[PDB]
Structures are given as C-alpha cells and as structure tokens.
Ligand binder design. Structure first.
Ligand code: F3S
Length: 58
C-alpha cells in the first residue's frame, strides 16, 4: 500500500489534498495511511503537492 516513508514529517498537505487516503497519525506526528489501496489521482496530487515526496506507491 501507499507509504509516506518515515523521513516524512507532517505537512498535512497530502491530508489537505486527500484526507481519505492520508490522515494524521494518533498525534499527527506522522502521516498515516487510510486508503492502502485507493484508486484516485489524489495520490498524484498528494505526491506532487508533497515537497518531501515521502509518498510512494510502494
Ligand atoms: S511531508 Fe508527510 S504529511 Fe503528507 S505532504 Fe509529504 S507525506
């Protein structure tokens, strides 16, 4: 499933783009995945919009 790696911080950008695919952890200390098998371009915008490009279709 999609992964935001660990190096990621918590910009919440991907969450602000697709909070249905990527949501804040328990404390927002890391971007947690919600749709480990989405099917939208949100991943494209969630990645592009992501400067840390920690999001990958691993
Ligand atoms: S920094 Fe982390 S919170 Fe989303 S926007 Fe890039 S995976």
């Amino acid at each position: 499933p999609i992964e935001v790696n660990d190096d990621c911080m918590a910009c919440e950008a991907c969450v602000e783009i697709c909070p249905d695919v990527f949501e804040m952890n328990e404390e927002g200390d890391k971007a947690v995945v919600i749709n480990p098998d989405s099917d939208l371009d949100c991943v494209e915008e969630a990645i592009d919009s992501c400067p840390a490009e920690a999001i990958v279709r691993s």
